[PDB]
Amino acid sequence: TDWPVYHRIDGPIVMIGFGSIGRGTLPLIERHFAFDRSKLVVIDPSDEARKLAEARGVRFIQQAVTRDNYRELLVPLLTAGPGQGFCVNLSVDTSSLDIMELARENGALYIDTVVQPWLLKPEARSNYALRETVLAARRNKPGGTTAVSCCGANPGMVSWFVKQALVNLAADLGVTGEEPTTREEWARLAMDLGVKGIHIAERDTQRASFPKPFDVFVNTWSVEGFVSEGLQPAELGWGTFERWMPDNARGHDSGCGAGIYLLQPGANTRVRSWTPTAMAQYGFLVTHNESISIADFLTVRDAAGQAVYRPTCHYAYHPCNDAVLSLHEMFGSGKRQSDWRILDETEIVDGIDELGVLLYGHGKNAYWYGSQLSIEETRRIAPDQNATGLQVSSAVLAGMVWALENPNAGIVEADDLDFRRCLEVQTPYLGPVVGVYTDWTPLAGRPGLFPEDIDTSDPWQFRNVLVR
Amino acid sequence: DWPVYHRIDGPIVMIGFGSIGRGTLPLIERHFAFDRSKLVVIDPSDEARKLAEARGVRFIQQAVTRDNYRELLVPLLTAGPGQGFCVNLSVDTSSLDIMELARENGALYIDTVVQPWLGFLKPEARSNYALRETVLAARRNKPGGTTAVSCCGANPGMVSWFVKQALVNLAADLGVTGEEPTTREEWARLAMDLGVKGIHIAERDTQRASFPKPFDVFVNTWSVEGFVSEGLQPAELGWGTFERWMPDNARGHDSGCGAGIYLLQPGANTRVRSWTPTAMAQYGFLVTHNESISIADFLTVRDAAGQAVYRPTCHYAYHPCNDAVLSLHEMFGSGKRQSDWRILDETEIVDGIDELGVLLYGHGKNAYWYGSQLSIEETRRIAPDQNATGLQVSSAVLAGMVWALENPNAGIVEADDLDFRRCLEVQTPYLGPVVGVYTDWTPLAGRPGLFPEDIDTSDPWQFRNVLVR
Ligand SMILES: NC(=O)c1ccc[n+]([C@@H]2O[C@H](COP(=O)([O-])OP(=O)(O)OC[C@H]3O[C@@H](n4cnc5c(N)ncnc54)[C@H](O)[C@@H]3O)[C@@H](O)[C@H]2O)c1
Ligand SMILES: NC(=O)c1ccc[n+]([C@@H]2O[C@H](COP(=O)([O-])OP(=O)(O)OC[C@H]3O[C@@H](n4cnc5c(N)ncnc54)[C@H](O)[C@@H]3O)[C@@H](O)[C@H]2O)c1
C-alpha cells in the first residue's frame, strides 16, 4: 500500500531549476525512482533555492546555466555514470532546445515543461516558432535518446486529457470499437465526432491568508514565467471551422500551419469560456505550446496535403484571484510590479486548481474533462507544493516514467506519449478527475443591452468567444 | 464640539436607509437642531427598519413608487410647522418626480443621483445626459422657487467643488492673473485660459475586507445594486473641444446642452488609463456619472453665435476596491449578476482609503490631482455607521443641506451652482487629507511598446490614447 517505485535511474539526475516546480518534483523523484541519493544534484542561482535544498539534504550547485557555460557544466554532470542519467529541466531563462540537444548528444534522457530561449518582432516571440525548432531538431536527428518536450500540466497532461475526452465522447454516444492508435486516427476521431475546438479551460481558486499587497505580483507558480508568457502575443491553434479573425491576427509563412497569433499581449486578452466550478467565466488567451501541438496533432489533410479538418485550440486561463488583481495592476500601470511572490501551501487557506480540456461543437455541445485537485488533498499526498504545482510535478513524474520505459524514442511531445500509461502514473496526484457536459455556449444571454458582432449560426466561433 | 449650523423647523423625510442613509442620518442629528420626532425614514427593507428602530426614529416600511409617491410623501412633506427637507438617498426612485413633488409643496430637496423609477429602452435613453436634460428642462419650465439640490454626493457633488479649487490653485501656480471667478462664464473662461484640455474624476478605493471575496458574491463599499446599474449603462463622457478622435461605437445627442457622448458598451467593462497619487498609473472604469456631463457643461465657453469654442473632456476613471474589481470580472465573465451581494461595513474593513479627486490635464504643468485621501481609520474616529466611501458622500449631503437652508429659494441647482467655499467649509472636517499633486505621467507613458497601437503621438491626453482598446 506504499508508493510504487517505477524504475531505477542508473546515472546522474541533474535538476536544472529549483523554483516552485522543482521543489514539488524533487520529492516525487525521490519517492518513485530507485537511485543512490548522491546521484542527484540541483542547479539554481537562487539563495532562497540553495537554503531549501540544504534543508532537503540534496546536492546543490548555485549557478545560472547560460549559453556560455552549459556545455562545461552539464556534460560532466550528465555523463558521470555508471549508466544513463536524466536531465530534469524546470528552469526559467534557459534554452530548452540547446540543453535538450546536449543531453541527447551525450546519451542522457531529458524532460522539460516549456520551450523557451536563453535569457524582436512578435512572430519571433511565438510558441509556434519555438515549437518549430523542436520539430526541426527531430527531423534532423530522428530516433536516439528520448527527450520529452513540454510535459507539465499544460502543456503536457492536457494532451492526455484530450485523448481520454475524445474516447469518452465516442463512448457516451454509444460508439464502440478499438480506440485510435495512430495520429491520423485520433485526428479523424475528432473530425468524425464534430469537435470544432478545444479550450484549455482552467480556474484556479486558491486563496491566500493575506490580502494582495499593493505593488506585488502574486501567483501560484512562476511570476517571472507567467508575466513573460502573458506579455507574448496571444496565440491559438486555428480551426478549419473558423470564419472570422481579428484585424490584428497574423499567420505563419512556414511550419505545421496550425497557428495564428494576435498583435496584443495574451494576459490582457479575454475569452469567454467555462469550467465546472466557475461555470461561465473569462479566461486569458495566454500563449501555450499545447494550443499549437494539439491542433497540429488533430489535423486531417487531403491527398494534396492541405488541412481539411483541424480544431481550434487555445488557453482560457482564469488564474487565482490575486493573480487577476496582479494583471489588472501590471497592465494598468504599464510596468511590472516592484516585487513578487509565489503562494506557498502554508499561505493558502483553501481552493483548487481546476484544469481540464473543454471540447466543443459536437452533438452534446461542450464537454469538460480534467482535474479538480484541492489544496487540502495536495497537502495529504505530496509535500512542498500547492495544487498548481502538484499537477505539474506529477506530469513531469509521468513523463520521466514514460521516458525510462521508452528510452530510444527520440524527441517527443506529450501528444506522442502513451496517454493511458502517463495518466496511470499521474492520476494518484490529480484528485477528482471528471467529465462534465454543459449546454453553455459563448452566446448565452447575447445579444444583450448593446449591439454586438456575433455569429448566431455557430455559437463557438472565435468571433463570439473573443472579448471585443 | 460639533457646529450646529441651523434649526430645521419642519419634517425631515429621508427616503432610503442604505449605506449612505445610515451614514447621513447621524450627521443630520449632529449638525442640525430640530424636533427629533419630526424625522421620518422610508425604506422597504426589514434591515433598514431594525436599524431605524434602534435609533428611535420614525420608520415607514414602504417602497416609494410612481403609483404611491404622491399619496405617501405629500402628507409627510407638508406636516409643518415649517419648511421640510426631503433627503433622497434611495435606489429605484425617480429623482425628478420626487424633486418636483417636494418643490410644489415648498419642501427643500437633495439627492445624489438622477435616476428613473424602477422598471417592470434605446441606449441613448439610458444615458445620464438624457436624465440630466430632464432636470434642466424642469428648471427652465419652473425657474427659481424652492431649492432642490440635484446630485450632491461625493461624485457627483464634492468633485465639482474640487474642480473650482483646483482651477484656483492652477491659476496661482501657472502665474495666470485675474480675480477669482464668481460666475459660470468666468469659471469656464478660466479653465480655457489655463488650457485645461480635460478632467478625470480619478478615484482609487483601497479599502480591504477582513474576509476574502466569496465566490458568486458581488462586494463593494457602497450600493451594489446602484453600482451595477450604473456600470451596465453606456460608458459616457463630457466631450472636450480638443478631442480629435472618437471610437466607431461612440454616439452623440441631437438636443440638449451638447456636452456629451456615449459608447455602445457598458461603462464598468470599459477601461481608461488614469492616475492618482496613491495608485500612480492605473486603469479606471469609464462608468457614467452625472458630473462627467455637468462639469463639462459648466466649463463651456461659447461664442456670440452660441457655438461651443471651448469645453473640457470630463469622465470617471474609477478603480474601486479590489473585491469590486474581482466582482466586475466575475459578473461580466459570467454574463449575469451574482446571486448574492454585500456592502463592506466599517467593522469588516482592515485598512485602506477612498482616494477621490479631480485630475486636470493638458495645461502647462501637464496634470494636477486635487482631492481627498480619507482613510477608514480616520472615518471611524470622526463619524459613525459608515466606511470612508460613505463618509465622503454623507458629508457632501450635509454640505448641500447647509447650503440649501442658507439659500432656500435658489430653484433647481446642481453641485456646480453652489458656493463651493461654503460647501467645502462644511465638508472638509470629514475629508481627511485634502491635497494637490502634480505629475509628469501621461497616457503615452511607455508607449508605443511591444505591439503596434493606434495612438496619437501629437497630444498625449487625447481620448484615443486614454481609452483601452
Ligand atoms: N507545462 C506546465 O504545466 C508548466 C507549469 C508551470 C511552469 N512551467 C514552466 O516552468 C517554469 C518554471 O516554473 P516555476 O514555477 O518553478 O518557476 P519559478 O520562477 O518558481 O522558478 C524558476 C527557477 O529558475 C531559476 N533560474 C533562473 N535562471 C536560471 C538559470 N539560468 N539556470 C538555472 N536556473 C535558473 C530561478 O532561480 C528559480 O528558482 C515556468 O516559467 C514555466 O515556463 C510549465
Ligand atoms: N453621488 C455620489 O457620490 C453617490 C455615492 C454613493 C451612492 N450614490 C447614490 O445613492 C444610491 C444609494 O446608495 P447606497 O450605498 O445607500 O445604496 P444601498 O443599496 O446601500 O441602499 C439603497 C436603499 O434604498 C432602499 N430602497 C430600494 N427601493 C426603494 C424605494 N422604492 N423607495 C425607498 N427606498 C428604497 C433599499 O431598501 C436600500 O436600503 C446609489 O444607488 C447611488 O446612485 C451616490
Grid coordinates representing B97 are 418626480
The three-class DSSP label of residue A386 is coil
* B11: closest CA of chain A, how far (Å): 41
Task: Give the whole-angstrom CA distance, residue A268 versus residue A278.
Answer: 20
Residues of B in contact with A331 (CB under 8 A): 283
CB–CB contact A281 B322 (8 Å): no
**Crossing angle between the packed helical segments A223-231 and A321-333, to the nearest 10 degrees:** 50
Comparing alpha-carbon positions, the chain A residue that sits nearest to B206 is A214
Q: Which helix (H) or strand (E) holds A425?
A: helix A419-426
CB–CB contact A446 B335 (8 Å): yes
Strand partners, A207: A350
The three-class DSSP label of residue A56 is helix
The CATH homologous superfamily to which domain B1-152+398-418 belongs is NAD(P)-binding Rossmann-like Domain (3.40.50.720)
Asked whether A391 lines ligand 1 (CB < 6 A), one says no
Nearest to A312 by CA among A294, A285, A288: A294
CATH, domain range A1-151+397-417? 3.40.50.720
User: Strand A249-250 and strand B349-351: pairing?
Assistant: unpaired
Residues B314, B290 contacting (CB under 8 angstroms): no
Strand partners, B58: B40
What does the H/E/C string look like for B328-366? Answer: HHHHHHHCCCCCEEEECCHHHEEECEEEEEEEEEEECCE
Grid coordinates representing B75 are 402628507
Task: Give the whole-angstrom CA distance, residue A24 versus residue A221.
Answer: 11
The three-class DSSP label of residue A168 is helix
CB–CB contact A332 B265 (8 Å): no
Q: How many CA atoms lie within 13 A of A38 on its CB side?
A: 3
Tell which CATH architecture fits domain A152-396+418-468: 2-Layer Sandwich (3.30)
The best mutation among B14, B15, B20 to test binding of ligand 2, ranked by most ligand atoms within 8 Å of the C-beta, falls on: B20
Q: Cβ atoms within 10 A of the Cβ of B468, count?
A: 15
**How many angstroms does the Cα of residue B54 sit away from the middle of ligand 1?**
58
Strand partners, A40: A13
Q: Angle at Cα A232 formed by Cα A230 and Cα A237, nearest 5°?
A: 95
Facing residue for B281 by CB, picked from A333, A446, A450? A333
Asked whether B18 lines ligand 2 (CB < 6 A), one says yes
Asked whether B155 lines ligand 2 (CB < 6 A), one says yes
A260, A264, A266, A267 alpha-carbon torsion, rounded to 10°: -170
Residues of B with CB under 8 A from a CB of A: 123, 126, 206, 208, 212-213, 215, 232, 234, 264-266, 271, 273, 280-283, 319, 322, 325-326, 329-330, 332-336, 350, 445-447, 449-452
Asked whether B89 lines ligand 2 (CB < 6 A), one says yes
Beta strands in A220-327 (DSSP E): 233-237, 249-250, 259-265, 270-275, 279-284, 300-301, 307-309, 312-318
Q: Give the domain ranges of chain B.
A: 1-152+398-418, 153-397+419-469
Instruction: Pick B153-397+419-469's CATH classification: 1.20.1560.10, 3.30.360.30, 3.40.50.2300, 4.10.640.10.
Output: 3.30.360.30
Substitution target in A205, A262, A281 with the highest count of B β-carbons within 10 Å is A281
Experimental technique used?
X-ray
CB–CB contact A214 B206 (8 Å): yes
Grid coordinates representing B360 are 486636470
Asked whether B64 lines ligand 2 (CB < 6 A), one says yes
CB–CB contact A122 B450 (8 Å): yes
Does a cis peptide bond (omega within 30 degrees of 0) precede residue B156? Answer: yes
Q: Angle at Cα A129 formed by Cα A124 and Cα A131, nearest 5°?
A: 145
CA distances from B305 to B131, B134, B137, B309 (A): 27, 25, 22, 10
CA distances from B212 to A223, A388, B215, B322, B326 (A): 22, 20, 9, 10, 11
Residues of A with CB under 8 A from a CB of B: 122, 205, 207-208, 211-212, 214, 231, 233, 248, 263-265, 270, 272, 279-282, 318, 321, 324-325, 328-329, 331-335, 349, 444-446, 448-451
Cβ within 8 Å of residue B279, ≥6 positions away: B204, B319, B355
Q: Which helix (H) or strand (E) holds A317?
A: strand A312-318
Residues B253, B293 contacting (CB under 8 angstroms): no
Substitution target in A347, A352, A449, A454 with the highest count of B β-carbons within 10 Å is A449
The helix/strand count (H/E) of chain B reads as: 14, 25
Residues of B in contact with A263 (CB under 8 A): 451-452
Nearest to A453 by CA among A279, A246, A270: A246
Residue type, A362: H
Residue reference for cell 494539439: A294
Asked whether B386 lines ligand 2 (CB < 6 A), one says no
The DSSP 8-state label assigned to residue A180 in this structure reads P
